[PDB]
Assembly symmetry: C3
Homo-oligomer: 173 residues x 3
Amino acid sequence: SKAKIGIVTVSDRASAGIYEDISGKAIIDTLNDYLTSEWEPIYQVIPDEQDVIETTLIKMADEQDCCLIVTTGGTGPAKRDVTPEATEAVCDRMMPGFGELMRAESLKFVPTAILSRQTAGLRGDSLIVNLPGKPKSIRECLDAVFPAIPYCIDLMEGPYLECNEAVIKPFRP
Amino acid sequence: SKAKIGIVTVSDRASAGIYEDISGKAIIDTLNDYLTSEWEPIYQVIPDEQDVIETTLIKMADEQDCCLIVTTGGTGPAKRDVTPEATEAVCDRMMPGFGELMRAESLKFVPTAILSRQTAGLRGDSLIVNLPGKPKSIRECLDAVFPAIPYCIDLMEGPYLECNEAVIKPFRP
Amino acid sequence: SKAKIGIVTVSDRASAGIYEDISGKAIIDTLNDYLTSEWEPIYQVIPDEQDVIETTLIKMADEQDCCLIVTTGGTGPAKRDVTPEATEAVCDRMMPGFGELMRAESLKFVPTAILSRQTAGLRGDSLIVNLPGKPKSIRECLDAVFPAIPYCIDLMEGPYLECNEAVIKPFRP
């Protein structure tokens, strides 16, 4: 089948209106650079509301057959930040290695990396990954974890993602 | 706002007034070396009864306005070690990066650091962090995570902690 | 007293009929290489059926007095990979530092290590640790965490395990 990839920008400010969604743009730019195979971006901007996040992810995974869903925003210690809660609530099983690696990688830049509650889990055969907010952090997190994603999707019997190996090298054992 | 920092020593020999608490003292000494801003320790020595640990953390967070609460003791694989369980019970959202980093740093010279179930989380605007009992493990764990703590407290709209940069360098993005 | 160690090969394929269980064999071979003290393998090969895994782990811990139980297989993101779910189910407290270290060490070879949901935890005084199926990965994970295992067993008041320190050095603080 053809790959559907969800992109969820979680932000009160973006939902109120911003000049440009630089976080969401950073994701689609990076994914376009990664992928040679055809794919369909399923994009949504939503507020920091746990229930709305959950609803969004559920539709993308269940109805829209998204094999991957990447979120940006709402992963810090602030009370409004509930993307990880929403993610835990919708996944059947978590992927501890992703949160581990993303923080380890982010800590190479900033001591405050350990304040991120970014996680990842599976809802059926969809992989959902929580990314940071800043465009450069987004690319740093994706460069770190995406090498494992096409294989993860393979094991989940999902679409076979083909990458521009001039940009990123998926590992497939 | 003057910063109030909770210090909780959990110990099976602590109904004894003659217990010398070298762990609590290590926390106090470390924080004294770290901080240049004024702060106030709210200090309790308690038995390793999960119920009592929970009541203590809740009081310090809900009543006594502790911006940060640091526990020592009761984090290992022994059946009586229930400090993590108490911590999970009172926190409304967990901070997985703290336990990850504390073990990662500690295991380099103490392989048995991986046996610590130490964790961290947030109760409202209070950051709660589990340390091991041994003073050297205490300094090591605080050195690894404290650089992220002033900014976490900033994001919580708590007091503004300042540090002696020759001893420890908090990061603020 | 006399050390009993559970070895569980989790594999639909092996359970169906296989010339040799290389996964289970890798574990036995590794332990024999590590230990100089007398120990008894409690060995079972079972399919990828969560209820079966849980039943097996419970028996090994509660009935068979296994101080350590090591699983191989079923830790990835595939539909039928349910070994970590079973381990979570039967353990009363988790040991997050094991999965962290195993993944972190594995990541130094192959970026897909982040796809393992391998975990570890305690059921009563039994330590249960998830390994991947591949024999090379089994030995790498064991090399990473075994140095902390004899001490953990000491803390849980179990058998005193002694090692060939020419192969592996248990750390006992």
